Amino acid sequence: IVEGSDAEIGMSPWQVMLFRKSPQELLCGASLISDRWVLTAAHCLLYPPWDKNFTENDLLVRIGKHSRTRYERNIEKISMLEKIYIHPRYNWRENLDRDIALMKLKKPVAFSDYIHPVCLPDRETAASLLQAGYKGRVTGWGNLKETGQPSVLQVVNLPIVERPVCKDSTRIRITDNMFCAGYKPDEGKRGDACEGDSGGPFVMKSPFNNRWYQMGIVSWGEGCDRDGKYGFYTHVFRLKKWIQKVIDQFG
């Protein structure tokens, strides 16, 4: 996260770290959506242009974390993966359309002060909240700059941007399964996701029921925190029918 700040303890208890077993390193962010299911970006698991194609046994999920590098004894919980499910129409060839994946845990994780699931939006909360100017929150242990790394989980709040502005900021083809967020050059403030934040959540706190909803997944950007560029996020509600299909069939 570029131009963010240290998270408070328990601020993002749905935050998940995807961790490579060998070598041991941060792979991506992710989020906890139930005691058995974790949501992430498909490109965290499958990205052929970079020879990335992880299998279940390659990774661990670490939940309840704050420190990036420490083993947080008595606080974090580490889970093995039972199965990975990638959206069948995930477009890794072109523009990361439908950049979404689910991971089922081998065993349910125990909730605690530090571990708790985020809500997924329904149509109404999505319609209400996904509007230009409305701010969400992005969290992760990714790089602090495009070109270093944080001691603890970072957080930044960013406004959703008008679709034509998103479209006009890039040569990449944008789709309805994406939205973009970030400050405009003239707005002064800044902030963005960066390498290592992929797969983490973009959340909004509903003013109607005071619950946090995951509206987006950190997906792609051109550099990090560049003037006139924006971060792109997977539109979770647009892909919710797939999420529910997977959970209903394999849950």
């Binding site: 601020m11 985020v118 969400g136 929150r137 709040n157 003013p207 005071n210």
Partner: peptide, 28 residues
């Protein structure tokens, strides 16, 4: 989950985090 999105150390105990107000103010 019936309890989703309510943080044990914040919403569950009626404590606010340092920047959530910034989000609320944007929801016009």
């Amino acid at each position: 989950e019936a309890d989703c999105g309510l943080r044990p150390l914040f919403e569950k105990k009626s404590l606010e985090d340092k920047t959530e107000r910034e989000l609320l103010e944007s929801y016009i």
